[PDB]
Amino acid sequence: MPSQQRVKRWGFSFDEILKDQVGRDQFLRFLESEFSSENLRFWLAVQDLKKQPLQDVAKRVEEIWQEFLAPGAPSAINLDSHSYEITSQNVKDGGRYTFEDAQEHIYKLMKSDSYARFLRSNAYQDLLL
Amino acid sequence: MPSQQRVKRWGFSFDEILKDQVGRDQFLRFLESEFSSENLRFWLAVQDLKKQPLQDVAKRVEEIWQEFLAPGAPSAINLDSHSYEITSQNVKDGGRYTFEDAQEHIYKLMKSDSYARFLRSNAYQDLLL
């Protein structure tokens, strides 16, 4: 069995249960009797995602979405609409907007600092007849 | 050659140059004489990223970072510190925080709605002796 000292520590804070795998397994059996175990399994799945090699992330994200959030998901969780929409966008985006702010800065830089100069260039003006 | 009508359209707005591949190539040759072509190549690289199959994104992101932003990058661009730090975090994160808001909502849900109930459970209390 586990000691009284650690069994007591689980009742100190929720974080203490999450940190101790035996307390967490006990909590999980409780959630199963509550029919709310999908919450812990999702949380655990997302923690595991953070530890994944880069090359495995995209697949794991899709698996988490399909398991917990997609239409017809076998372990549907309930989110506030805000975090659902953000999550759905992140999953759909799939890393493709990693350089959004950077690209916007550079777009503005070219527009303000290079574009008007081009138009004044002989390179350009020589084309205009 | 290109017509006067389209050559003129390039001077209508910067977006018109970016849309027309012949105007864009002309702009690029100008940037090369300005030694600022890395700005356009970065912008173009990021546009191409948005069109990539999911399985290719992670690699392409690392290639863009290495080409334009990493220490010792062959085509160094200059960003404001803010977009640099955001970009660097996005690249490092690598999709692993796709479920950040969702996980936080579920963490709070378990803490508020399930945790205290567990502690009151016979499941738990039976362990305490």
PDB file of all heavy atoms in Angstrom, chain A residues 83-106, unseen atoms left out:
ATOM      1  N   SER A  83     -11.639  28.529 -25.811  1.00  0.00           N
ATOM      2  CA  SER A  83     -10.501  27.627 -25.906  1.00  0.00           C
ATOM      3  C   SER A  83     -10.739  26.574 -26.984  1.00  0.00           C
ATOM      4  O   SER A  83      -9.786  26.109 -27.595  1.00  0.00           O
ATOM      5  CB  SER A  83     -10.153  27.003 -24.556  1.00  0.00           C
ATOM      6  OG  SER A  83     -11.244  26.293 -24.050  1.00  0.00           O
ATOM      7  N   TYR A  84     -11.997  26.229 -27.248  1.00  0.00           N
ATOM      8  CA  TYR A  84     -12.303  25.327 -28.363  1.00  0.00           C
ATOM      9  C   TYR A  84     -11.905  25.930 -29.709  1.00  0.00           C
ATOM     10  O   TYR A  84     -11.280  25.261 -30.534  1.00  0.00           O
ATOM     11  CB  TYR A  84     -13.786  24.937 -28.418  1.00  0.00           C
ATOM     12  CG  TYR A  84     -14.087  24.044 -29.614  1.00  0.00           C
ATOM     13  CD1 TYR A  84     -13.888  22.660 -29.556  1.00  0.00           C
ATOM     14  CD2 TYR A  84     -14.527  24.587 -30.814  1.00  0.00           C
ATOM     15  CE1 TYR A  84     -14.144  21.848 -30.663  1.00  0.00           C
ATOM     16  CE2 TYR A  84     -14.781  23.786 -31.918  1.00  0.00           C
ATOM     17  CZ  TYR A  84     -14.586  22.421 -31.841  1.00  0.00           C
ATOM     18  OH  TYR A  84     -14.848  21.646 -32.953  1.00  0.00           O
ATOM     19  N   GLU A  85     -12.287  27.185 -29.931  1.00  0.00           N
ATOM     20  CA  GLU A  85     -11.999  27.844 -31.198  1.00  0.00           C
ATOM     21  C   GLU A  85     -10.507  28.050 -31.393  1.00  0.00           C
ATOM     22  O   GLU A  85     -10.005  27.877 -32.502  1.00  0.00           O
ATOM     23  CB  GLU A  85     -12.740  29.180 -31.313  1.00  0.00           C
ATOM     24  CG  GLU A  85     -14.266  29.045 -31.355  1.00  0.00           C
ATOM     25  CD  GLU A  85     -14.782  28.225 -32.544  1.00  0.00           C
ATOM     26  OE1 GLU A  85     -14.075  28.135 -33.579  1.00  0.00           O
ATOM     27  OE2 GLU A  85     -15.909  27.672 -32.439  1.00  0.00           O
ATOM     28  N   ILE A  86      -9.808  28.420 -30.321  1.00  0.00           N
ATOM     29  CA  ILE A  86      -8.355  28.552 -30.355  1.00  0.00           C
ATOM     30  C   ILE A  86      -7.685  27.213 -30.640  1.00  0.00           C
ATOM     31  O   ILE A  86      -6.769  27.136 -31.455  1.00  0.00           O
ATOM     32  CB  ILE A  86      -7.795  29.145 -29.036  1.00  0.00           C
ATOM     33  CG1 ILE A  86      -8.203  30.617 -28.932  1.00  0.00           C
ATOM     34  CG2 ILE A  86      -6.282  29.032 -28.997  1.00  0.00           C
ATOM     35  CD1 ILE A  86      -7.502  31.399 -27.829  1.00  0.00           C
ATOM     36  N   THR A  87      -8.145  26.167 -29.960  1.00  0.00           N
ATOM     37  CA  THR A  87      -7.595  24.834 -30.156  1.00  0.00           C
ATOM     38  C   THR A  87      -7.801  24.369 -31.590  1.00  0.00           C
ATOM     39  O   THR A  87      -6.887  23.842 -32.207  1.00  0.00           O
ATOM     40  CB  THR A  87      -8.238  23.810 -29.213  1.00  0.00           C
ATOM     41  OG1 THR A  87      -8.125  24.264 -27.858  1.00  0.00           O
ATOM     42  CG2 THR A  87      -7.548  22.463 -29.358  1.00  0.00           C
ATOM     43  N   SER A  88      -9.005  24.572 -32.105  1.00  0.00           N
ATOM     44  CA  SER A  88      -9.353  24.152 -33.449  1.00  0.00           C
ATOM     45  C   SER A  88      -8.506  24.877 -34.511  1.00  0.00           C
ATOM     46  O   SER A  88      -8.054  24.274 -35.477  1.00  0.00           O
ATOM     47  CB  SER A  88     -10.840  24.406 -33.691  1.00  0.00           C
ATOM     48  OG  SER A  88     -11.243  23.855 -34.927  1.00  0.00           O
ATOM     49  N   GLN A  89      -8.298  26.171 -34.321  1.00  0.00           N
ATOM     50  CA  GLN A  89      -7.430  26.942 -35.200  1.00  0.00           C
ATOM     51  C   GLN A  89      -5.976  26.447 -35.157  1.00  0.00           C
ATOM     52  O   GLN A  89      -5.340  26.300 -36.195  1.00  0.00           O
ATOM     53  CB  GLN A  89      -7.481  28.424 -34.817  1.00  0.00           C
ATOM     54  CG  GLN A  89      -6.720  29.323 -35.772  1.00  0.00           C
ATOM     55  CD  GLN A  89      -6.792  30.781 -35.386  1.00  0.00           C
ATOM     56  OE1 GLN A  89      -6.198  31.195 -34.389  1.00  0.00           O
ATOM     57  NE2 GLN A  89      -7.511  31.571 -36.180  1.00  0.00           N
ATOM     58  N   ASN A  90      -5.461  26.200 -33.952  1.00  0.00           N
ATOM     59  CA  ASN A  90      -4.095  25.703 -33.774  1.00  0.00           C
ATOM     60  C   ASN A  90      -3.888  24.382 -34.502  1.00  0.00           C
ATOM     61  O   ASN A  90      -2.880  24.199 -35.207  1.00  0.00           O
ATOM     62  CB  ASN A  90      -3.767  25.511 -32.294  1.00  0.00           C
ATOM     63  CG  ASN A  90      -3.566  26.811 -31.561  1.00  0.00           C
ATOM     64  OD1 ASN A  90      -3.473  27.878 -32.175  1.00  0.00           O
ATOM     65  ND2 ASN A  90      -3.489  26.734 -30.231  1.00  0.00           N
ATOM     66  N   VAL A  91      -4.853  23.476 -34.339  1.00  0.00           N
ATOM     67  CA  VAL A  91      -4.797  22.172 -34.973  1.00  0.00           C
ATOM     68  C   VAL A  91      -4.879  22.321 -36.488  1.00  0.00           C
ATOM     69  O   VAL A  91      -4.122  21.680 -37.211  1.00  0.00           O
ATOM     70  CB  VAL A  91      -5.927  21.226 -34.477  1.00  0.00           C
ATOM     71  CG1 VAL A  91      -5.927  19.921 -35.269  1.00  0.00           C
ATOM     72  CG2 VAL A  91      -5.786  20.931 -32.997  1.00  0.00           C
ATOM     73  N   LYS A  92      -5.792  23.166 -36.967  1.00  0.00           N
ATOM     74  CA  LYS A  92      -5.928  23.388 -38.408  1.00  0.00           C
ATOM     75  C   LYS A  92      -4.687  24.058 -39.003  1.00  0.00           C
ATOM     76  O   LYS A  92      -4.176  23.594 -40.015  1.00  0.00           O
ATOM     77  CB  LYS A  92      -7.179  24.211 -38.745  1.00  0.00           C
ATOM     78  CG  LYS A  92      -8.388  23.386 -39.218  1.00  0.00           C
ATOM     79  CD  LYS A  92      -9.358  22.952 -38.099  1.00  0.00           C
ATOM     80  CE  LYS A  92      -9.215  21.472 -37.728  1.00  0.00           C
ATOM     81  NZ  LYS A  92     -10.228  21.071 -36.727  1.00  0.00           N
ATOM     82  N   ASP A  93      -4.229  25.144 -38.373  1.00  0.00           N
ATOM     83  CA  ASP A  93      -2.999  25.864 -38.755  1.00  0.00           C
ATOM     84  C   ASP A  93      -1.798  24.928 -38.896  1.00  0.00           C
ATOM     85  O   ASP A  93      -1.040  25.017 -39.864  1.00  0.00           O
ATOM     86  CB  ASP A  93      -2.636  26.894 -37.684  1.00  0.00           C
ATOM     87  CG  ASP A  93      -3.476  28.173 -37.752  1.00  0.00           C
ATOM     88  OD1 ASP A  93      -4.481  28.206 -38.485  1.00  0.00           O
ATOM     89  OD2 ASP A  93      -3.101  29.152 -37.046  1.00  0.00           O
ATOM     90  N   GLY A  94      -1.599  24.079 -37.888  1.00  0.00           N
ATOM     91  CA  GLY A  94      -0.584  23.034 -37.929  1.00  0.00           C
ATOM     92  C   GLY A  94       0.845  23.526 -38.030  1.00  0.00           C
ATOM     93  O   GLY A  94       1.696  22.857 -38.640  1.00  0.00           O
ATOM     94  N   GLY A  95       1.109  24.681 -37.428  1.00  0.00           N
ATOM     95  CA  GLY A  95       2.436  25.292 -37.438  1.00  0.00           C
ATOM     96  C   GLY A  95       2.719  26.239 -38.593  1.00  0.00           C
ATOM     97  O   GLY A  95       3.755  26.890 -38.618  1.00  0.00           O
ATOM     98  N   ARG A  96       1.788  26.348 -39.532  1.00  0.00           N
ATOM     99  CA  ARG A  96       2.014  27.111 -40.769  1.00  0.00           C
ATOM    100  C   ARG A  96       2.119  28.628 -40.562  1.00  0.00           C
ATOM    101  O   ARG A  96       2.564  29.344 -41.460  1.00  0.00           O
ATOM    102  CB  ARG A  96       0.921  26.806 -41.780  1.00  0.00           C
ATOM    103  CG  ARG A  96       0.982  25.405 -42.342  1.00  0.00           C
ATOM    104  CD  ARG A  96      -0.178  25.176 -43.276  1.00  0.00           C
ATOM    105  NE  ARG A  96      -0.284  23.792 -43.747  1.00  0.00           N
ATOM    106  CZ  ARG A  96      -0.924  22.814 -43.096  1.00  0.00           C
ATOM    107  NH1 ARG A  96      -1.525  23.049 -41.936  1.00  0.00           N
ATOM    108  NH2 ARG A  96      -0.976  21.587 -43.609  1.00  0.00           N
ATOM    109  N   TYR A  97       1.731  29.106 -39.378  1.00  0.00           N
ATOM    110  CA  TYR A  97       1.729  30.542 -39.076  1.00  0.00           C
ATOM    111  C   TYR A  97       2.727  30.892 -37.976  1.00  0.00           C
ATOM    112  O   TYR A  97       2.599  31.903 -37.296  1.00  0.00           O
ATOM    113  CB  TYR A  97       0.290  30.999 -38.794  1.00  0.00           C
ATOM    114  CG  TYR A  97      -0.538  30.815 -40.042  1.00  0.00           C
ATOM    115  CD1 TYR A  97      -1.071  29.570 -40.372  1.00  0.00           C
ATOM    116  CD2 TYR A  97      -0.702  31.857 -40.946  1.00  0.00           C
ATOM    117  CE1 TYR A  97      -1.774  29.381 -41.542  1.00  0.00           C
ATOM    118  CE2 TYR A  97      -1.404  31.682 -42.119  1.00  0.00           C
ATOM    119  CZ  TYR A  97      -1.941  30.442 -42.414  1.00  0.00           C
ATOM    120  OH  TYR A  97      -2.637  30.272 -43.583  1.00  0.00           O
ATOM    121  N   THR A  98       3.744  30.035 -37.854  1.00  0.00           N
ATOM    122  CA  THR A  98       4.881  30.214 -36.973  1.00  0.00           C
ATOM    123  C   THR A  98       5.569  31.581 -37.153  1.00  0.00           C
ATOM    124  O   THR A  98       6.049  32.155 -36.170  1.00  0.00           O
ATOM    125  CB  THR A  98       5.910  29.068 -37.222  1.00  0.00           C
ATOM    126  OG1 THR A  98       5.353  27.808 -36.810  1.00  0.00           O
ATOM    127  CG2 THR A  98       7.214  29.289 -36.488  1.00  0.00           C
ATOM    128  N   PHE A  99       5.597  32.090 -38.394  1.00  0.00           N
ATOM    129  CA  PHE A  99       6.316  33.338 -38.735  1.00  0.00           C
ATOM    130  C   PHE A  99       5.387  34.535 -39.010  1.00  0.00           C
ATOM    131  O   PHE A  99       5.759  35.446 -39.749  1.00  0.00           O
ATOM    132  CB  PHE A  99       7.211  33.099 -39.963  1.00  0.00           C
ATOM    133  CG  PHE A  99       8.237  32.014 -39.768  1.00  0.00           C
ATOM    134  CD1 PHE A  99       8.047  30.756 -40.305  1.00  0.00           C
ATOM    135  CD2 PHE A  99       9.391  32.260 -39.042  1.00  0.00           C
ATOM    136  CE1 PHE A  99       8.997  29.744 -40.122  1.00  0.00           C
ATOM    137  CE2 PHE A  99      10.346  31.257 -38.851  1.00  0.00           C
ATOM    138  CZ  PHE A  99      10.150  29.999 -39.401  1.00  0.00           C
ATOM    139  N   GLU A 100       4.191  34.531 -38.419  1.00  0.00           N
ATOM    140  CA  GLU A 100       3.157  35.549 -38.701  1.00  0.00           C
ATOM    141  C   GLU A 100       3.595  36.980 -38.413  1.00  0.00           C
ATOM    142  O   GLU A 100       3.437  37.871 -39.255  1.00  0.00           O
ATOM    143  CB  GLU A 100       1.882  35.250 -37.898  1.00  0.00           C
ATOM    144  CG  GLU A 100       0.676  36.128 -38.246  1.00  0.00           C
ATOM    145  CD  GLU A 100      -0.635  35.645 -37.592  1.00  0.00           C
ATOM    146  OE1 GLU A 100      -0.581  34.772 -36.677  1.00  0.00           O
ATOM    147  N   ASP A 101       4.104  37.211 -37.209  1.00  0.00           N
ATOM    148  CA  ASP A 101       4.545  38.557 -36.810  1.00  0.00           C
ATOM    149  C   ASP A 101       5.791  38.967 -37.595  1.00  0.00           C
ATOM    150  O   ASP A 101       5.867  40.071 -38.111  1.00  0.00           O
ATOM    151  CB  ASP A 101       4.817  38.624 -35.306  1.00  0.00           C
ATOM    152  CG  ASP A 101       3.566  38.380 -34.483  1.00  0.00           C
ATOM    153  OD1 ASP A 101       2.632  39.219 -34.545  1.00  0.00           O
ATOM    154  OD2 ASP A 101       3.508  37.337 -33.798  1.00  0.00           O
ATOM    155  N   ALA A 102       6.741  38.050 -37.698  1.00  0.00           N
ATOM    156  CA  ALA A 102       7.950  38.254 -38.487  1.00  0.00           C
ATOM    157  C   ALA A 102       7.632  38.627 -39.932  1.00  0.00           C
ATOM    158  O   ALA A 102       8.166  39.598 -40.451  1.00  0.00           O
ATOM    159  CB  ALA A 102       8.817  37.017 -38.437  1.00  0.00           C
ATOM    160  N   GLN A 103       6.763  37.861 -40.578  1.00  0.00           N
ATOM    161  CA  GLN A 103       6.413  38.143 -41.968  1.00  0.00           C
ATOM    162  C   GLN A 103       5.751  39.515 -42.130  1.00  0.00           C
ATOM    163  O   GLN A 103       5.979  40.202 -43.121  1.00  0.00           O
ATOM    164  CB  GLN A 103       5.491  37.069 -42.533  1.00  0.00           C
ATOM    165  CG  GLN A 103       5.214  37.234 -44.036  1.00  0.00           C
ATOM    166  CD  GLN A 103       4.274  36.189 -44.589  1.00  0.00           C
ATOM    167  OE1 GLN A 103       3.429  35.640 -43.862  1.00  0.00           O
ATOM    168  NE2 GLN A 103       4.398  35.913 -45.894  1.00  0.00           N
ATOM    169  N   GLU A 104       4.911  39.885 -41.169  1.00  0.00           N
ATOM    170  CA  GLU A 104       4.211  41.169 -41.206  1.00  0.00           C
ATOM    171  C   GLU A 104       5.201  42.332 -41.062  1.00  0.00           C
ATOM    172  O   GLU A 104       5.085  43.347 -41.748  1.00  0.00           O
ATOM    173  CB  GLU A 104       3.133  41.210 -40.109  1.00  0.00           C
ATOM    174  CG  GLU A 104       2.346  42.521 -39.997  1.00  0.00           C
ATOM    175  CD  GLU A 104       1.587  42.898 -41.273  1.00  0.00           C
ATOM    176  OE1 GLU A 104       1.305  41.993 -42.107  1.00  0.00           O
ATOM    177  OE2 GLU A 104       1.255  44.108 -41.434  1.00  0.00           O
ATOM    178  N   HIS A 105       6.174  42.174 -40.169  1.00  0.00           N
ATOM    179  CA  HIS A 105       7.219  43.182 -39.991  1.00  0.00           C
ATOM    180  C   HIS A 105       7.990  43.376 -41.302  1.00  0.00           C
ATOM    181  O   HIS A 105       8.179  44.500 -41.758  1.00  0.00           O
ATOM    182  CB  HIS A 105       8.163  42.775 -38.856  1.00  0.00           C
ATOM    183  CG  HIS A 105       9.247  43.771 -38.580  1.00  0.00           C
ATOM    184  ND1 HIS A 105      10.523  43.634 -39.085  1.00  0.00           N
ATOM    185  CD2 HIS A 105       9.245  44.921 -37.865  1.00  0.00           C
ATOM    186  CE1 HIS A 105      11.261  44.655 -38.690  1.00  0.00           C
ATOM    187  NE2 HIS A 105      10.512  45.450 -37.946  1.00  0.00           N
ATOM    188  N   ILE A 106       8.385  42.266 -41.927  1.00  0.00           N
ATOM    189  CA  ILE A 106       9.146  42.306 -43.177  1.00  0.00           C
ATOM    190  C   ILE A 106       8.305  42.812 -44.356  1.00  0.00           C
ATOM    191  O   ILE A 106       8.807  43.552 -45.210  1.00  0.00           O
ATOM    192  CB  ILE A 106       9.745  40.913 -43.500  1.00  0.00           C
ATOM    193  CG1 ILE A 106      10.736  40.480 -42.401  1.00  0.00           C
ATOM    194  CG2 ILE A 106      10.400  40.890 -44.873  1.00  0.00           C
ATOM    195  CD1 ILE A 106      11.919  41.398 -42.199  1.00  0.00           C
TER     196      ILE A 106
END
